[PDB]
Design a protein around this ligand. Sequence first.
Ligand code: CAC
Ligand code: CL
Ligand code: SR
Ligand code: SR
Length: 135
Amino acid sequence: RGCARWCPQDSSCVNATACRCNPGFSSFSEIITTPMETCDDINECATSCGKFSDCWNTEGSYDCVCSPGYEPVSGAKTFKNESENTCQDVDECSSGQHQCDSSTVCFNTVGSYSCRCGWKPRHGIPNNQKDTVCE
Ligand SMILES: C[As](C)(=O)[O-]
Ligand SMILES: [Cl-]
Ligand SMILES: [Sr+2]
Ligand SMILES: [Sr+2]
């Protein structure tokens, strides 16, 4: 029809006297009729990303990301649903991404990894940690 100029932030005019919140935002009434009404972000993460991932809420949207220690086989850094999830554990030992001391051997774990000592751990540092150092 027409277009109200006074639509509040994150809403768009539906005609000359009304607005509606943009996708990802919500207001008490389905149709806004005054500029005093607000369009608040909807936290989609509080309403499934799938295995080994995390939901991060953003303004107007949200993103699923592989959790730390996992990376997407498909390569897509962000995704929207379980169906697009390609998160697999990162084998830090095979990839040489680990930061183990030359005195230990990298041992892969799901979501992480550790370093094991023949040798014995130096004083004050346990065995089987990322910072393990032996002698
Ligand atoms: C950290 As999760 C796999 O429950 O989105
Ligand atoms: Cl949203
Ligand atoms: Sr949101
Ligand atoms: Sr790992």
